[PDB]
Amino acid sequence: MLKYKEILETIIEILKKNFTESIFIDDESVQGSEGSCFFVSILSVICTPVMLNTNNKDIVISIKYLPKPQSKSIRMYEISDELNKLFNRNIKVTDRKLNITKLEQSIKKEESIYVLNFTFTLNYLDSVYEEDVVYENMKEINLNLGE
Amino acid sequence: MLKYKEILETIIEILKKNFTESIFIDDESVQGSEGSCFFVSILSVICTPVMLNTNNKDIVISIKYLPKPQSKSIRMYEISDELNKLFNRNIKVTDRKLNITKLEQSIKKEESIYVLNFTFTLNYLDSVYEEDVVYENMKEINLNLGE
Amino acid sequence: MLKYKEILETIIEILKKNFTESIFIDDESVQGSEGSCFFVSILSVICTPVMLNTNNKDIVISIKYLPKPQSKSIRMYEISDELNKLFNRNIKVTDRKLNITKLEQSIKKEESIYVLNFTFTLNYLDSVYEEDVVYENMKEINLNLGE
Amino acid sequence: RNVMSGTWGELWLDGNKVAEVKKFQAKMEFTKEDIIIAGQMGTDTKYMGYKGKGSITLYHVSSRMHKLIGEKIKRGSEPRFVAISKLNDPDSYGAERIAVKNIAFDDLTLADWEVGVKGEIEAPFTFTEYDFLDII
Amino acid sequence: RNVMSGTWGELWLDGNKVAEVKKFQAKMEFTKEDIIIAGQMGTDTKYMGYKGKGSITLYHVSSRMHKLIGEKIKRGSEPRFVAISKLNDPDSYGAERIAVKNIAFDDLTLADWEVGVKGEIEAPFTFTEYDFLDII
Amino acid sequence: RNVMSGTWGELWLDGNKVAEVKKFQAKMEFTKEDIIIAGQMGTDTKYMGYKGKGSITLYHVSSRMHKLIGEKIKRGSEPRFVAISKLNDPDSYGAERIAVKNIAFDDLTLADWEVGVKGEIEAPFTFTEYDFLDII
Amino acid sequence: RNVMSGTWGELWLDGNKVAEVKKFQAKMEFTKEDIIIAGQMGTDTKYMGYKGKGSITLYHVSSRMHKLIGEKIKRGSEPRFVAISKLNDPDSYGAERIAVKNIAFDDLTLADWEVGVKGEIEAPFTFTEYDFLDII
Amino acid sequence: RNVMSGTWGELWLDGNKVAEVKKFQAKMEFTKEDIIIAGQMGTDTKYMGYKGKGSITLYHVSSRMHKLIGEKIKRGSEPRFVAISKLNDPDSYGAERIAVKNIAFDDLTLADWEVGVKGEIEAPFTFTEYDFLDII
Amino acid sequence: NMEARNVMSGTWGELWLDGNKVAEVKKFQAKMEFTKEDIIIAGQMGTDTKYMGYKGKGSITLYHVSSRMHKLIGEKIKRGSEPRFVAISKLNDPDSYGAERIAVKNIAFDDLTLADWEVGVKGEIEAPFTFTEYDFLDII
Amino acid sequence: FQKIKIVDTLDIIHSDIRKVIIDDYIGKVTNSYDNKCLLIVAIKSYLEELEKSALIESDSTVEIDFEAQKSYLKSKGVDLSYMTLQEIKEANTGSKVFLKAKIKVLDAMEDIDLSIEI
């Protein structure tokens, strides 16, 4: 059973390697930032049973770049290209590769400032927890055939 | 006829066993909390007749975790894993096991703070109340065959 | 892999050639403008895999004309005709021609002032990044046929 | 003063009430032969007989049909059954009872299940006789 | 007190449990000949036999069917198999086990894939015999 | 531990890799004759052979099929081809390679275009032989 | 490096360019006879010939088809035509030209209109010969 | 410079203008026999004739068809009619007039109504002859 | 013991003609017809029969791929000299109990086909014959 | 192997396969596993053609030579422990390709025994 924390930390590690701006997880930290921070969160998870002991999972992950200093939109257009390079077909989390099904991107204004919203979806199958009792092997088989 | 109060109390007992944070039912109590409370409620119930004396019921149950102290989002990501472990296929309420059909999760901001919303749906059949009169057994059967 | 920055700069160059009003990229610059500015941004990008190594991309591009001085709406109706002339079937970006699939236009009021919103969609195929190892040619082929 | 609602439907099969029943249907389809009469432009028909058809839909709650027919069918002996349907809507005008007789089923479903789906059984049949009880 | 849900379905094929199974179905279709009896308006039928039909749907996880039949089919020898299905819903009334015997499959899928689609295999078959275990 | 996704599918046709391929499918359909045995209610079957069927879907990028078959078909000589399909999902358990041989196509599309639509070609075929490489 | 888009499609019919054309299609359907060979499980086929089929869709702008065939068809003499299709997408790799010859149309539409609907004409045909020009 | 719109459609039936007409259609379907020529791979066809087909759709405003055919049909005498259709869009290039002759209708609708639905009549027919007036 | 799989399929048949294997056989046939005479016996209502002899008749159907029968019989038939042949048929279905192999001797053909073709139709040849003797090899 | 005819047929088959090997794959095709599969398929089709003409007995097999490949891997210093069979099969082997084929041939009639009882 894969952990969401591990996925988030792997993505944060990729971002830390390939970028110099700071990456935050809480809304409080981004308001204290002086300029050009990152915000990463898991947007939605949908879980559906496909077999008796396995589930199908779709996860939406959102990466936001918020330019605080004035006149930083061309940086917003370069960062999208870098992010497009980073995430292509799959990402590797705890010796597992998870397929990427689609990528969506938008540039809109939140309150008074425009921001970049980069999102992509992951799809994979995971197994559910269960407890099974133990039996010993058959040692004696007694069959009697009447008449 | 299963009672909604029993379902809610069973889920509250599970949460109390597996967690150390407080669990609340009313909105008033969560605002007085100093930090990291839980909120549990039944979101929606839909009832449809499938037979003459039985109904089909879909129940949506919402569990919210609200981090009051600053810098508590990584806890928000661990709690989701624990909750995923807790609710898998069915839950047992008053010597009955109720199937879980799907699980949905989202992380959004309410007012100025981000929160975690963990929801799942239950599906089961229940019988409706009815009053039936009593008859005594047949003691005398008089049949006359004419012509 | 085509860059979004290049597409934006090509469109800005076309606008600069064919118009005398200023073209801006950030919201901060348009509020400082004394009159009749332009605003250009990429609205949305949707990326879907169609083959093993290629992606399908749909890009929505928005061009806004904001008349600051009073009584400038007839200019808003001439500018739409000029823009209709400029973008017809395809645009050329870095020795490539990208097809234009549809054009949508609206005139609505944002806050207290009416504005013109000119949008069109681009469709093209792009190839994803991959790393391939190198093999040397077959020099010796040893086959033994038994019995 | 309402149309009859199928929510108030009850079924008896082989003398046993079927608590889990979703829908019931029974129809008689007449056999007609075309006859052309000299001097007449419109084509007429002659009535020859009928065939009874119907089906039952029920939720998968027990092995009712298995116990009814499975063992007898293998040995080469086919059983026949009687069904009684009642439709009594409290808002409607009255009750309607019909007996369907000499029922022979068309198939037997051993297993049919799918993940995430609650099971249902639909069983077509053919009949020959009927009786009217409490017609409106 | 629920209807049985197909989420609690298990399958054994050729003595091996099939962990990846999506749905299972098996049905017996009777053969009926129409007989018209003199003096009787309703048309009756005579039972002559049955044909067994079914199919299995599973996710593409291994080359199970290839190893089962591919090499033997080419040489002109056809194998037969035995399947056991179990439906045991914890909320339902009881379990239901059925054995389906003398199974012969209808086809073999070598490759079927599409971009962006997770693979599935559906395999129709025909059978002749069956046995009841733990009927409700 | 995933089901194989068709996004990781590769095709070789006539010894040449097909970079633009959308989906691939190949199936063997058995021929069965009904046999009724005296004293047995269930109807059995006899296996007599099979027919191979499949199709390829690819985007319109070049005149591959034209160069393959167009000139030879006119003169009355029909060519045969060999195809190799590979499905290797990194998350899945292993790779699967199958060779399809003695392929004969069913038709040839000269032109098919519509305004606002990107072109695709679908090409059914029939085959006779196959080989297993790297089955799971 | 794109797939060819049908927006860049051009047609010449009877030596005259058709400015209003919505879609064009032409296909060759092979005739195959089944042959069973002794000792071989897979069924083979023999190639016998082909039939050419296609259709044109155009907006109702003039009486092109009327002037083409209407008067000649009544007198009992059937005409044949030649068509040339070109698909040249600027983003694609190259152009593709094909000539379709010995065309005989299947029908003639005299009038077809509906309130609130802009008129279109679709015209199936059959052909026999073809030629390759500027294949990629 | 527009495509002709069916909103500008007019019909004359039996010399009387039909004010309420929803759509009109008339088509000629050719009869073709397949001929295989020795030494030629492509299969050719021979033109043998045609059949005229069409239909009229109109709103239920009067008993037009009843008065046209109902009494005569019963006695065994069948009438024939002439229809003229005109399509003259002000934005289009020109007008188009066609006469359809020797019309025989296929059926007669006596009554067809439903609660909450406004009535319409659709009347198929067959024809033999035609004439061109004011073709573009 | 009886199973549907035990029925022999005709796809597993093989034929040798004049010592040469023919790969192109569609069907093979050989059968003996008995000659019987009715005998009415006094005092008996059911009439009886007397066996007197037999006729062997058969046929071979093959896909048209070569001129086998032309080379076999064409030149000798014109000169007035009739040839005789021997055929061996084998039926070996892997799912059956065993093989069946029969030799048919003293075969004389009934006709010779020089040309039979039609446009759009694939070629086939049918050759009836008669025979007198036979042997059994590997019967079930 | 003491008979001339069997060895002659084996040599003829080997030399006829060798031309198809050299004229196409030697020095022109990269030493990848996909190309190895293509070569195996071509060789198998060639052997099936000989099986049809009754030159050799049916049910011949063509596959990657496992023992020679493992020996080469040992000679190159690679470690063969905790390695799957499939992992060894598609390992990189530089410029060397190892293949194994299995066919069957029959002898002619040489000695005949006839027992006759009077």
mmCIF file of N, CA and C in Angstrom, chain F residues 10 12 15-17 82 84 86 95 97 99 101 129-131 133-135, chain J residues 32-35 37-38 40-42 44-46 48 52 62 86 89-90:
data_model
loop_
_atom_site.group_PDB
_atom_site.id
_atom_site.type_symbol
_atom_site.label_atom_id
_atom_site.label_comp_id
_atom_site.label_asym_id
_atom_site.label_seq_id
_atom_site.Cartn_x
_atom_site.Cartn_y
_atom_site.Cartn_z
ATOM 1 N N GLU F 10 4.360 -1.772 -29.022
ATOM 2 C CA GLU F 10 5.228 -1.584 -30.174
ATOM 3 C C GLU F 10 4.899 -2.625 -31.233
ATOM 4 N N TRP F 12 6.140 -4.269 -35.208
ATOM 5 C CA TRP F 12 7.028 -4.428 -36.351
ATOM 6 C C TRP F 12 6.233 -5.072 -37.474
ATOM 7 N N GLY F 15 9.250 -6.465 -41.099
ATOM 8 C CA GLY F 15 10.593 -6.175 -40.650
ATOM 9 C C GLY F 15 10.868 -4.724 -40.329
ATOM 10 N N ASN F 16 9.884 -3.844 -40.478
ATOM 11 C CA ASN F 16 10.049 -2.417 -40.240
ATOM 12 C C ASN F 16 9.209 -1.999 -39.044
ATOM 13 N N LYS F 17 9.807 -1.226 -38.144
ATOM 14 C CA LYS F 17 9.075 -0.721 -36.994
ATOM 15 C C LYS F 17 8.040 0.310 -37.429
ATOM 16 N N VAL F 82 4.688 -10.641 -42.127
ATOM 17 C CA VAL F 82 4.888 -11.091 -40.755
ATOM 18 C C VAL F 82 4.881 -9.869 -39.847
ATOM 19 N N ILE F 84 5.266 -8.542 -35.612
ATOM 20 C CA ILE F 84 5.704 -8.843 -34.253
ATOM 21 C C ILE F 84 5.215 -7.728 -33.342
ATOM 22 N N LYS F 86 4.863 -6.245 -29.308
ATOM 23 C CA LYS F 86 5.491 -6.278 -27.995
ATOM 24 C C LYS F 86 4.732 -5.362 -27.050
ATOM 25 N N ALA F 95 7.301 -8.612 -20.020
ATOM 26 C CA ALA F 95 7.039 -8.305 -21.417
ATOM 27 C C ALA F 95 6.372 -9.489 -22.105
ATOM 28 N N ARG F 97 5.798 -10.911 -26.161
ATOM 29 C CA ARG F 97 6.084 -10.805 -27.586
ATOM 30 C C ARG F 97 5.355 -11.915 -28.328
ATOM 31 N N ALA F 99 4.563 -13.268 -32.506
ATOM 32 C CA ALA F 99 4.749 -13.136 -33.942
ATOM 33 C C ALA F 99 3.515 -13.669 -34.653
ATOM 34 N N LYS F 101 2.012 -14.537 -38.443
ATOM 35 C CA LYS F 101 2.615 -14.903 -39.715
ATOM 36 C C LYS F 101 1.548 -15.222 -40.752
ATOM 37 N N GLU F 129 -0.524 -18.563 -38.886
ATOM 38 C CA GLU F 129 0.460 -19.105 -37.958
ATOM 39 C C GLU F 129 0.830 -18.065 -36.908
ATOM 40 N N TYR F 130 1.438 -18.536 -35.822
ATOM 41 C CA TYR F 130 1.910 -17.644 -34.771
ATOM 42 C C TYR F 130 2.998 -18.350 -33.975
ATOM 43 N N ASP F 131 3.751 -17.560 -33.211
ATOM 44 C CA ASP F 131 4.816 -18.070 -32.360
ATOM 45 C C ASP F 131 4.862 -17.273 -31.066
ATOM 46 N N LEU F 133 6.983 -15.690 -28.038
ATOM 47 C CA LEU F 133 8.269 -15.219 -27.546
ATOM 48 C C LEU F 133 8.044 -14.470 -26.240
ATOM 49 N N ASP F 134 8.774 -14.853 -25.196
ATOM 50 C CA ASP F 134 8.733 -14.137 -23.918
ATOM 51 C C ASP F 134 7.313 -14.029 -23.363
ATOM 52 N N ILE F 135 6.613 -15.160 -23.282
ATOM 53 C CA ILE F 135 5.323 -15.167 -22.605
ATOM 54 C C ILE F 135 5.535 -15.116 -21.095
ATOM 55 N N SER J 32 20.750 -5.602 -30.606
ATOM 56 C CA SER J 32 19.699 -5.401 -29.624
ATOM 57 C C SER J 32 18.801 -6.631 -29.586
ATOM 58 N N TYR J 33 18.013 -6.737 -28.515
ATOM 59 C CA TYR J 33 17.173 -7.917 -28.335
ATOM 60 C C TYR J 33 16.046 -7.978 -29.362
ATOM 61 N N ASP J 34 15.515 -6.821 -29.768
ATOM 62 C CA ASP J 34 14.459 -6.794 -30.778
ATOM 63 C C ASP J 34 14.952 -7.384 -32.094
ATOM 64 N N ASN J 35 16.159 -6.999 -32.505
ATOM 65 C CA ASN J 35 16.743 -7.527 -33.729
ATOM 66 C C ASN J 35 17.023 -9.019 -33.609
ATOM 67 N N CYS J 37 15.197 -11.105 -31.865
ATOM 68 C CA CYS J 37 13.893 -11.731 -32.060
ATOM 69 C C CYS J 37 13.514 -11.773 -33.536
ATOM 70 N N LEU J 38 13.796 -10.693 -34.270
ATOM 71 C CA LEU J 38 13.520 -10.685 -35.705
ATOM 72 C C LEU J 38 14.296 -11.785 -36.424
ATOM 73 N N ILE J 40 15.469 -14.565 -35.111
ATOM 74 C CA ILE J 40 14.930 -15.859 -34.702
ATOM 75 C C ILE J 40 13.669 -16.188 -35.493
ATOM 76 N N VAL J 41 12.788 -15.201 -35.670
ATOM 77 C CA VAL J 41 11.554 -15.432 -36.418
ATOM 78 C C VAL J 41 11.864 -15.802 -37.866
ATOM 79 N N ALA J 42 12.818 -15.097 -38.483
ATOM 80 C CA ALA J 42 13.183 -15.415 -39.862
ATOM 81 C C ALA J 42 13.725 -16.837 -39.982
ATOM 82 N N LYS J 44 13.129 -19.363 -37.993
ATOM 83 C CA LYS J 44 12.049 -20.314 -37.753
ATOM 84 C C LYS J 44 11.172 -20.489 -38.988
ATOM 85 N N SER J 45 10.867 -19.393 -39.688
ATOM 86 C CA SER J 45 10.097 -19.517 -40.925
ATOM 87 C C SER J 45 10.858 -20.329 -41.969
ATOM 88 N N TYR J 46 12.168 -20.094 -42.082
ATOM 89 C CA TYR J 46 12.961 -20.872 -43.028
ATOM 90 C C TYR J 46 12.917 -22.359 -42.692
ATOM 91 N N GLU J 48 10.497 -23.932 -41.060
ATOM 92 C CA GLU J 48 9.160 -24.439 -41.359
ATOM 93 C C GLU J 48 9.007 -24.756 -42.840
ATOM 94 N N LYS J 52 7.852 -28.418 -44.378
ATOM 95 C CA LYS J 52 6.744 -28.694 -45.292
ATOM 96 C C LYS J 52 7.158 -29.644 -46.411
ATOM 97 N N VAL J 62 13.716 -23.143 -32.593
ATOM 98 C CA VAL J 62 14.795 -22.163 -32.650
ATOM 99 C C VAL J 62 14.685 -21.272 -31.421
ATOM 100 N N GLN J 86 14.802 -14.820 -17.553
ATOM 101 C CA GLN J 86 14.483 -13.799 -18.546
ATOM 102 C C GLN J 86 15.523 -12.686 -18.544
ATOM 103 N N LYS J 89 18.400 -13.916 -20.431
ATOM 104 C CA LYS J 89 18.116 -14.108 -21.849
ATOM 105 C C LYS J 89 18.305 -12.821 -22.645
ATOM 106 N N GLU J 90 17.852 -11.686 -22.110
ATOM 107 C CA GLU J 90 17.933 -10.418 -22.823
ATOM 108 C C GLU J 90 19.055 -9.523 -22.312
#
